[PDB]
Write a protein that binds this ligand. Structure first.
Ligand SMILES: Cc1cc2nc3c(=O)[nH]c(=O)nc-3n(C[C@H](O)[C@H](O)[C@H](O)COP(=O)(O)OP(=O)(O)OC[C@H]3O[C@@H](n4cnc5c(N)ncnc54)[C@H](O)[C@@H]3O)c2cc1C
Ligand SMILES: Cc1cc2nc3c(=O)[nH]c(=O)nc-3n(C[C@H](O)[C@H](O)[C@H](O)COP(=O)(O)OP(=O)(O)OC[C@H]3O[C@@H](n4cnc5c(N)ncnc54)[C@H](O)[C@@H]3O)c2cc1C
Ligand SMILES: N[C@@H](CCCC[NH3+])C(=O)O
Ligand SMILES: N[C@@H](CCCC[NH3+])C(=O)O
Lengths: 583, 583
């Protein structure tokens, strides 16, 4: 039979194993071996240290599956709309296939977020009469979205940028229009060779950029990423659609991928196993044969016996690839081998994304204190439309965004009310990291060896809780001393995605890359080594996808490999929806 | 005889060799072997790719030693005052011993810097007339220095913090006063377990922090480093003294260390060799015996045969130590060895500093355009503190500070006029890095393999030059369209210190560390490993010193090792000058 070896039981790896079995590529007698460094709870309460999988982690208050929860990783999806060809098609199809469509609910955001900017409190609808305190004439009386759309249109000009295919084409062929007005960037410049922040800064000045970075929505990415992709993903014609979540958490999707793959494997006679607490240590090729070593979670740097497979999936992000590549980079490898991850073209293409650090603080309260009548600046979570919403509130602080989940349980547990506090960006990673150790304690774990998110959300220190409460007091009262009015959380925990093995909350395409060429060619890295024998060793996950903010991109890269390198029939309608960009 | 093996011919490694020979520790029949990854010009024109050494690099315009220059790395020092016992003692003694004291000149800074903040132009002397555009009442009418001094006093209370000894003791034992007024931090908290930015932000709010970060002097430092050390180094009572530089460049210190060591070694019968384009690849211990491999610069990841020495100095910063540790971390090491750099206590103490990325753009103009009579906001380089000065101009832009060196040429007929543009901090690294590749081109070198500073200042792209001129136009004209008024530079080059092998402009002691214990014990890392045989393997350099901004710290740690582990008589008077903190 045929053995399929998957390293990483995150979304991409789990989706791959589920498609191989349910799509009927793995037949009776075949083997699927999934290896996961972490110890996720696939088999109910007590079967792991946190719910699955990777950067998706639903966290229930007190670890009570009947309680309110906060998504401590990825939190929402965009429902596929086939009449518009927009939304997370594989996520929507997979939820339906797993029998979970009945649990899909709206994730509603306020039309009138509170903005806390340079010590001013401005509800977004009021900007026409209370201009934002940024020296950016015109733009400061409009939501930041108006400035995003304006900058996008200065970059895209008259180019069609409405469909997914047109957007893909702009990544490679998009040029600044003949009308581009700049001292720095000539008209006709290749937009994919421009940094988004660099050109936003050129066109709107530091105050226009800072206003957009401080007051913009969650989904508009202002880091210095590929300007071609940034323009089409932040503009008027950016992909959109209805935001949804899975009632009871996103993690159940990954529990069901695993359990349904195992039930289908039993019916098909396929040997499907998950081996947790076990990492890929090193990988290399001998012609088409993938050689690899495993390491235990207890001793992650020491490899075991050399194993072989004809089919290997590296279902793991850049920082995780880096740790595997480090294990052979400096080694004296066997004669006739190819140290594939350290080949020059593979290392170059792996740098086709930049990294954004993220930290999430999850706080449960015994009452929804933010709704009290005497709160000076409450979040506007009701009407402004009709349904109830989760916020956010948006600020120029380290605590850059707040979501208010409240009691999102089925109502049978003792009511707790959840708040998600978001810290992001290179600017702030060093700010938040020192809050992770108690003020009475020295650091004990070397930072690059603290695999905190891999194990599960970590108890918030008293310093971290107090800092969050200070920032929420400034947001909702305008007085740091009001932190005394906020009740102490009944539970507070954090996920710091900058730590290994994740090394990032998010990846974004880099400037000075041909995005489509990286998306196409990085998946089978032997293609980036001139003269190499093809091998079925693949790189999959959201990082080198066309949907980097989303589980969708993990599923799409995995699907693209099954289609292109295993000849499988896709479950998607790709007519108007390329899984990854073509060049 | 006795062999001394030094890895890294930066300031620390060169100083070590010089002291070993000129102090008479190495005697006739001994050997000193220095290995350097780079290829520095120690022997005049044609002898390397840039002037020595490490993060000190004088850059002459057009590679003309008679032209104006700009320090493309470290630029100034504090002259030792033995009467007050204040300043950079070893740097001053070394310049004197090398015969370079007659090249020492004042490095003067304006007492009335131009501030460009949130699109407003304010000369610092006029903040009473035109308050800084930050919502920080009182603080915004005073120089940022006042706020720095106020915060330091809130942290230090009545603790004496004027002497090196007392500053060292504050790192380990210093506590917030009983009067500390904070929601986040209790009175009496250990200041060394607090992040400086965390507590600044707590006490002064985001607008007070942002004003200090944007408008503070060059030496001011708001990163989230150890609050005990930050309070005593940012306070009214920070280490002071008269700022100087070496006319003709700081690099000639390092040329002269090498040449004079070689001459002295030849007179003494010591074999002194510098082998460049050759790096330490891997290091480990067998009892007291230092085992190592070298790699060529051409093939930096492939080690040669195992070599041994009894005396080894790792004269290289954290990111450089990290690359050497990576080469054994994942290896199956020989029987009876100690993989010293990957020992738990060594890895923990190596994380006792955080890193600050820095980028320097050096621009030479054919005329001092900033002095022209029609310039709306010229720098006040002439009068206010009596003699002429180099600036700076201070801004809230990515281009955070400007220095104006002008014509410092020594005998050209066609002098040029130099400008130093500084970009720093984790916030901006991704902003400046995309300017490093031409707008017509894709990236070609993997970012972690682009050893740019090692080679030498790189030609600025046209996009980088235009960005700097745009920022200088906004600063000096308040009109981005005035960029057309600035003459195109004769030469523009950059040094990005975030790149390997440096991985930082600067290191700063971290929160949640006992600074003194790390300073003392990291130097001989076998002392951090229970059961290990002691070995003469040392870690030296600025990063784990008590003078992290400065060459002084490289010399002090190197001096401390020669005194503590080789029984050498110090050249310093340590009466009021501990080389490193004592515990
Ligand atoms: C703060 C945050 C918010 C998000 N919000 C959303 C959202 O609202 N909706 C959404 O759809 N997406 C969201 N995402 C993105 C989503 O989390 C990712 O797209 C998705 O988790 C990517 O899946 P992946 O399988 O590619 O990688 P990962 O989730 O990173 O999984 C990789 C797996 O590989 C394992 N691994 C690593 N190294 C090894 C090794 N050597 N051997 C074996 N196993 C290894 C890891 O432990 C992990 O389990 C968010 C992400 C973050 C961080
Ligand atoms: C922007 C900037 C401004 C500064 N301003 C000042 C200032 O005004 N005044 C001042 O006094 N100081 C200043 N400094 C600091 C000064 O540059 C440093 O303190 C000093 O260079 C540190 O010397 P070092 O020997 O510890 O390390 P480095 O200068 O980093 O030298 C280490 C050496 O080790 C080599 N190396 C690395 N890995 C290996 C390997 N595996 N094998 C062999 N060799 C290896 C490197 O190539 C390098 O030559 C500044 C620094 C920067 C970046
Ligand atoms: N995926 C993140 C942010 C959205 C980014 C979209 N560009 C979340 O919804 O939690
Ligand atoms: N080395 C700097 C001092 C500050 C460095 C730390 N950011 C100088 O030239 O004065």
């Amino acid at each position: 039979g045929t053995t399929y070896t998957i390293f990483g039981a995150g979304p991409a790896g789990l989706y791959t194993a589920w498609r191989l079995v349910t799509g009927g590529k793995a037949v009776a007698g075949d083997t699927i071996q999934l290896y996961e460094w972490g110890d996720y709870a696939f088999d109910g309460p007590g079967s792991g240290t946190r719910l699955p999988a990777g950067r998706i982690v639903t966290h229930f208050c007190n670890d009570d599956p009947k309680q309110s929860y906060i998504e401590a990783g990825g939190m929402r999806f965009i429902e596929w709309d086939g009449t518009k060809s927009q939304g997370h098609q594989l996520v929507t199809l997979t939820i339906q296939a797993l029998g979970l469509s009945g649990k899909v609910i709206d994730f509603n955001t306020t039309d009138n977020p509170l903005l806390f900017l340079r010590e001013e409190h401005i509800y977004q609808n009021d900007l026409a009469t209370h201009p934002a305190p940024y020296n950016t004439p015109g733009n400061n009386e409009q939501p930041a979205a108006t400035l995003f759309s304006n900058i996008s249109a200065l970059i895209t000009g008259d180019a069609p940028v409405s469909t997914r295919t047109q957007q893909c084409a702009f990544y490679g062929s998009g040029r600044l229009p003949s009308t581009f007005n700049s001292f720095v960037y000539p008209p006709g410049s290749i937009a994919g060779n421009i940094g988004y922040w660099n050109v936003f800064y050129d066109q709107a000045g530091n105050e226009g950029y800072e206003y957009a970075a401080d007051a913009g929505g969650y989904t508009s990415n202002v880091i210095n990423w590929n300007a071609a992709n940034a323009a089409v993903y932040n503009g008027e014609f950016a992909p959109g659609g209805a935001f949804k979540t899975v009632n009871g958490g996103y993690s159940q999707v990954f529990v069901q991928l695993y359990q349904q793959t195992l039930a289908a494997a039993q019916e098909a006679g396929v040997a499907f196993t998950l081996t947790q607490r076990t990492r890929l240590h090193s990988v290399w090729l001998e012609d088409d044969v993938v050689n690899y070593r495993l390491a235990s979670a207890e001793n992650p740097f020491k490899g075991g016996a050399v194993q072989t497979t004809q089919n290997a999936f590296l279902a793991m992000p850049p920082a995780s690839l880096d740790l595997v590549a480090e294990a052979t980079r400096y080694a004296d490898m066997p004669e006739g081998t190819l140290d594939i991850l350290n080949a020059e073209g593979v290392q170059l293409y792996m740098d086709g994304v930049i990294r954004q650090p993220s930290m999430r603080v999850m706080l449960f309260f015994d009452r929804p204190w933010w709704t009290d009548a005497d709160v000076p600046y409450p979040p506007d979570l009701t009407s402004d439309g009709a349904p109830n919403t989760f916020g956010p509130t948006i600020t120029d602080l380290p605590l850059r965004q707040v979501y208010y989940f409240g009691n999102n349980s089925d109502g049978t547990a003792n009511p707790v009310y959840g708040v998600l506090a978001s810290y992001d960006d290179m600017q702030y990673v060093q700010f938040w990291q020192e809050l992770e150790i108690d003020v009475g304690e020295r650091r004990k774990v070397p930072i690059d060896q603290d695999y905190q998110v891999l194990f599960g959300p970590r108890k918030a220190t008293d310093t971290m809780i107090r800092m969050v409460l200070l920032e929420l007091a400034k947001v909702h009262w305008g007085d740091p001393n009001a932190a005394h009015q906020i009740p102490w959380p009944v539970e507070a925990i954090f996920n710091d995605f900058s730590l290994n093995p994740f090394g990032a909350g998010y990846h974004a395409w880099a400037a000075h890359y041909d995005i489509c060429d990286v998306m196409q060619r990085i998946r089978q890295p032997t293609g980036l080594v001139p003269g190499a024998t093809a091998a079925n060793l693949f790189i999959i996950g959201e990082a080198y996808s066309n949907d980097q903010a989303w589980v969708e991109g993990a599923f799409c890269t995995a699907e693209s490999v099954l289609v292109d390198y295993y000849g499988m029939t896709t479950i998607a309608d790709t007519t108007n929806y390329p899984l990854i960009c073509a060049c």
